[PDB]
Symmetry: C3
Subunit: 213 residues, 3 copies
């Protein structure tokens, strides 16, 4: 949380477009400069060479009680962030949802938990991030509790509307109220680093490069 109360904050398309050229590392270093951890440890890229940027649409699961359906609600440009207590014994994403995502402008799926139909996901080149791969259905194993509620994954809060950026290094949560400022800082981090890389690739010591830049 922040020094100001939480408020749903729209994020300009331009800020999202900029994230096309930003790595999770830059965004994480920017967040760190604001005193905030953003990484979701253990939530790994499952499809080589993929990445996504979009607005968190949150999904929270709970134990079966009763005594995929939510996906029709998810806006174009969303990254779905699903929390199932880090469970490895059932999956909360598969082929139907993947095909749906691809047909409905959904950018990627981040899972505190596991997914199935990995071959379809790979074949579709869909940006899936999860704690792993399994095949057993959610049916009679876990059930939807609520969507568009705050999630807490490894102590990191994800609010509906937060900026999600994911790549080969994993997933970063950027609070919506800070998104423009974090993206600005991340761009500056990338610029400084590019000069450092250019320097060491021209025979500078790292020592030299780091304090000329």
């Amino acid at each position: 949380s922040l020094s100001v109360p939480f408020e749903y904050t729209p994020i300009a398309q331009s800020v999202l477009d900029e994230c096309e050229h930003l790595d999770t590392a830059s965004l994480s270093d920017a967040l760190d400069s604001l005193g905030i951890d953003g990484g979701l440890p253990g939530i790994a890229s499952q499809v080589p060479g993929t990445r996504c940027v979009g607005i968190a649409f949150t999904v929270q699961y709970q134990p079966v009680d009763a005594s995929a359906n939510y996906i029709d609600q998810v806006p174009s440009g969303s990254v779905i962030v699903s929390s199932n207590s880090g469970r490895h014994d059932c999956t909360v994403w598969g082929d139907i949802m993947t095909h749906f995502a691809l047909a409905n402008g959904i950018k990627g799926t981040v899972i505190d938990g596991v997914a199935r139909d990995i071959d379809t996901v790979i074949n579709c080149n869909y940006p899936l991030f999860s704690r792993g791969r399994f095949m057993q259905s959610a049916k009679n194993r876990t059930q939807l509790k609520a969507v568009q509620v705050p999630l807490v994954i490894d102590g990191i809060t994800i609010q509906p509307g937060d900026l999600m950026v994911c790549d080969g290094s994993g997933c970063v949560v950027v609070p919506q109220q800070l998104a423009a400022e974090v993206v600005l800082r991340a761009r500056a981090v990338e610029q400084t680093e590019r000069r450092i890389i250019e320097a060491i690739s021209s025979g500078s010591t790292l020592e030299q490069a780091r304090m000329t830049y």
Copy 2:
């Protein structure tokens, strides 16, 4: 102990671990082997379990064509029970894949051979003076899931499923139903149907 009909094996060749698991669920059976991951991207196998039990301190000549070797090494990470020699043997003798409760070596060879290997991970220390073959063609227990010699193994990118041989026809039939239904749902989704519309 029961052979499986060839037509059941043939149908299964176009089924997924998800379809088979959903079918098993409908019969009240868990099929999945948690933690036993695909080690070779893009591979799959369907075949008959030939079982191998190791114990703390070869058999391959006995393995029938069309077998999927399922080897239990108590989930150990300090030694391996599959490597290059066995991969090359499998490929020359119609062996369809290997599933290991434990780890495998010569991962680079397995990948280059496109061999369907499924394991708890990758390592290089040899079984020799670490683990020894105890028995073959005995029932195995992996993550509480029993595997009998003869059971139908189906393995892909999502992991490995054990289908009890005595029920294989019913499971495969149900699994085909699950798959046919989903194909229709996916078709409708691609033409722009809502998920609710598609499930109606």
Copy 3:
């Protein structure tokens, strides 16, 4: 113990040897060399070189790393911060560093893959070392998975993982490992032309 240099021709001969062969050779001397859980992060890569060790501790050095080194970085197996990323990858490519082995995690995996740099670690993450972990010392002994790694040891890593070869035994282990592969080649060729495994062993 003694610091033991290793001839370039031994390194060159080791260039194509699989980690399985080196482990089998080590076993013949009664030595465990494998680092379980330290997994290849860049499909199809491998490295051979001399361990330059780096120890981190809870809350730079790379200019001191000789060409031909494999950097072995110990970070208590931590998953919350990374000790390798894009700057260091481009440094290694410009300075003849052969690969990096991490007891912990690395970032900028997409750059590392694109540079085809041989990286081995317990995984992938993006959070910086800054204000999370700090350099303790270099060229000190490390302990990873109960295996002691001395600066100067021969490191060999591939798809199957990472092997530590004690420098005093390195030349012997490489020669034995070559023998292992030659023996196995004859077996594989017998198998591939239709021999039983039994016949192929003899």
